[PDB]
Amino acid sequence: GASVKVAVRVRPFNSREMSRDSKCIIQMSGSTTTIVNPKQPKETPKSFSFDYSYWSHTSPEDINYASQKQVYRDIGEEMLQHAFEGYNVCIFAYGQTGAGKSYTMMGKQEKDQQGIIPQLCEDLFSRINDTTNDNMSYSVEVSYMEIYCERVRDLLNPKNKGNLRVREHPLLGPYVEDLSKLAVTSYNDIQDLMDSGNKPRTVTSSRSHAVFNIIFTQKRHDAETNITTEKVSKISLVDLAGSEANINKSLTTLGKVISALAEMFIPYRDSVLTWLLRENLGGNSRTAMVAALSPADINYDETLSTLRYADRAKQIRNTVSVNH
Ligand SMILES: Nc1ncnc2c1ncn2[C@@H]1O[C@H](COP(=O)(O)OP(=O)(O)NP(=O)(O)O)[C@@H](O)[C@H]1O
Numbered sequence: 426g427a428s429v430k431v432a433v434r435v436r437p438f439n440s441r442e443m444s445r446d447s448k449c450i451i452q453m454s455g456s457t458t459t460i461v462n463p464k465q466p467k468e469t470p471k472s473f474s475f476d477y478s479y480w481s482h483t484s485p486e487d488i489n490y491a492s493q494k495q496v497y498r499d500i501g502e503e504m505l506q507h508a509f510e511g512y513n514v515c516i517f518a519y520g521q522t523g524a525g526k527s528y529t530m531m532g533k534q535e536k537d538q539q540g541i542i543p544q545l546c547e548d549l550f551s552r553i554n555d556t557t558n559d560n561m562s563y564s565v566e567v568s569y570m571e572i573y574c575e576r577v578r579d580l581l582n583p584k585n586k587g588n589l590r591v592r593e594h595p596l597l598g599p600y601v602e603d604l605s606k607l608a609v610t611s612y613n614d615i616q617d618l619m620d621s622g623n624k625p626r627t628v629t630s631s632r633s634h635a636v637f638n639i640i641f642t643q644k645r646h647d648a649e650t651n652i653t654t655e656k657v658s659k660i661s662l663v664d665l666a667g668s669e670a671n672i673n674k675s676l677t678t679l680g681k682v683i684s685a686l687a688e689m690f691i692p693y694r695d696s697v698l699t700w701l702l703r704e705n706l707g708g709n710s711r712t713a714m715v716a717a718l719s720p721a722d723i724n725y726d727e728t729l730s731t732l733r734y735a736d737r738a739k740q741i742r743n744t745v746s747v748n749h
Pocket residue numbers: 435436437439481521522523524525526527528529629630631665666667668717
């Protein structure tokens with residue numbers, strides 16, 4: 426029994442917003458985020474409470490600013506530790522187009538702005554390499570895919586122009602048939618794959634989803650008999666397309682799955698995204714949602730919609746057990 430962790434993050438104004446002289450309608454204090462409706466200024470502002478509240482509207486010179494490193498060391502390290510404990514984990518970024526989902530998950534591979542995914546990978550390998558018990562050995566395999574109009578593309582295998590089939594293994598759940606799963610032995614190798622994968626994405630409103638998966642295997646060697654008990658945790662880091670057809674089936678279905686789970690049949694199979702993430706939503710997985718928010722008055726409805734779906738997500742609870 427573990428509830429879905431939910432964080433909200435508000436970014437700086439973008440060019441569109443500055444050009445319309447947008448005012449900031451988002452306020453944050455502690456774990457409370459309040460949104461002002463520019464349309465009805467005298468109506469009571471709506472407040473929401475979340476596990477994490479990242480005020481990233483200003484800049485690093487600000488004392489209360491939430492940087493990439495701070496967002497990661499917070500929710501990121503939390504989930505990585507769960508993976509070390511043997512739990513499957515998932516972190517997905519959700520929000521309006523341009524709200525800051527990719528910046529939070531991937532960031533920029535330059536000076537100081539790496540997002541959750543690169544940092545977690547670096548942290549994962551750093552920890553593995555600091556192991557001092559020779560009875561422990563590890564394996565790290567990675568997969569990276571894109572879901573566009575219900576079709577799946579293998580980002581680590583651009584050579585291939587066929588969309589992979591999402592299937593249901595009779596006993597082990599959903600999987601992408603013939604999706605590349607590469608073993609990596611260093612942060613540098615996994616980062617090259619990440620960079621290669623990011624470049625083959627399409628290709629400026631995204632309407633594809635990106636799923637970066639890591640299969641982290643921990644092998645404990647028992648000295649006396651020679652059996653090696655395995656510990657496997659799947660780490661799924663998701664960067665969703667923004668919210669505003671076959672192009673939008675996945676996002677709408679996710680909304681319904683999230684609402685249904687919060688309400689407690691579920692249309693998991695109604696879309697490739699919810700099908701593949703079935704166990705992370707209501708299964709054996711420690712899951713977190715990072716809701717990206719625009720700070721601008723002009724996006725009140727979209728932002729309010731995001732806050733509401735993030736509020737429901739908070740109510741989801743999943744039965745978790747360590748994979749030993
Ligand atoms: N915390 C932040 N600090 C600085 N810039 C940010 C931050 N969050 C987002 N941005 C920028 O604002 C834009 C939103 O980026 P991303 O590109 O992160 O959006 P989404 O990924 O929200 N968009 P979309 O994929 O089209 O649905 C980009 O130009 C980012 O570099």
